[PDB]
Amino acid sequence: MNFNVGVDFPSFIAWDGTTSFPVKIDGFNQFGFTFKVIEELTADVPFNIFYHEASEADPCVPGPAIRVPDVPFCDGVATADGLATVVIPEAVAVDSFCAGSVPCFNGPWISIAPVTVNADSAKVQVTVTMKGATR
Amino acid sequence: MNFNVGVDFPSFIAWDGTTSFPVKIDGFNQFGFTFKVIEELTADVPFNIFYHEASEADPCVPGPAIRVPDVPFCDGVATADGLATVVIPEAVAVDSFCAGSVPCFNGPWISIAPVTVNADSAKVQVTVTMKGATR
């Protein structure tokens, strides 16, 4: 049987390859990213993870981008500057995907974009999946 | 607490507004689409659902597109031509999403593309989500 998962676990585009799209995580209580490649890379591509606050002039529009802070785990160490980041390694083949998520929520909107807009970053696709809603 | 939902419910782009992407569903046992609108629509936009099969030249590359057949339920009547279709209505707001899924599997590859490529089609985004994996 087929269950129509999209009702319970909606997914949204985040980085189609040439533009970044804010995603509203407010209405749901869990989420996570998913990375996929479409062509071979040449060097490790790093990504920055932000969060947005409500716009002052209009409550229904996201505000400016703010970098997500890092939370040290129970047994590890913080990053070089305490900010969250991700890197897609070279060994990733085209027929593979990578998943990861942040430990804390922060603002109601979330966003992601590469550190650089070179030709390598255009070969990656990112989307956000949501868990059961609360409204 | 936040989870790594991408581990269990990965998401793949299917229609970014300018191009379609075949999505491999062979490894999973359920799936479903998710439609989002980024701008005000001007007229109803219908969508076509296709499925592919493994090519002879390479057993890991999709072949040509074969249009999905209809499957009437216990109530209602079959389509005029017995082929699946999806219609996004005029009233969809920019801040809402839709969900729908096919009753039957067919081949191991699936795809979705609009009937006509026009300015109205560029205002839509489609994504696919997966249920638990089998491998």
Binding site: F35, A84, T85, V86, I88, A99 | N4, G27, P59
Partner: peptide, 27 residues
């Protein structure tokens, strides 16, 4: 530094050849 979890979609482990000892050439 989010630690990603990775695994491939395909199920085609490369078909490794087997090479057997040559016929009896000698020194």
């Amino acid at each position: 530094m989010i630690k990603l979890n990775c695994r491939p979609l395909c199920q085609t482990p490369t078909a490794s050849r087997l090479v057997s000892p040559p016929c009896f050439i000698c020194r």
